[PDB]
Design a protein around this ligand. Structure first.
Ligand SMILES: [Cu+2]
Length: 105
């Protein structure tokens, strides 16, 4: 299944919309640049079920998305470990642009 997370709400808030999502291993999350760019998508190296920096890096998109309508996607590994994956937008982290994906069966 492919799910869409907007970067910046339609109201213009510095949030992911939605900010929490439950998926299965192998699902894709599309991150769509929506409002108040630039944004990026960085998975936390410690706050994933494997506490694996490499895993987090593989899921992340560090380059800034500059224009509304740009997108990037993360397809989770087929054997992604179950549990919680915290991610954030680097420029807007301090303003609260933090999200969480939960992988479950
Ligand atoms: Cu942002």
């Amino acid at each position: 299944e492919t799910y869409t997370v907007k970067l910046g709400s339609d109201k213009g808030l510095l949030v992911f919309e939605p900010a929490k999502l439950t998926i299965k291993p192998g699902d894709t999350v599309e991150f769509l640049n929506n409002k108040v760019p630039p944004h990026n998508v960085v998975f936390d190296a410690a706050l994933n079920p494997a506490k694996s920096a490499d895993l987090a890096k593989s899921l992340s998109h560090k380059q800034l998305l500059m224009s509304p309508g740009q997108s990037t996607s993360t397809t989770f590994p087929a054997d992604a470990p179950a549990g919680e994956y915290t991610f954030y937008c680097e420029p807007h982290r301090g303003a609260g642009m933090v999200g969480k994906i939960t992988v479950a069966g």
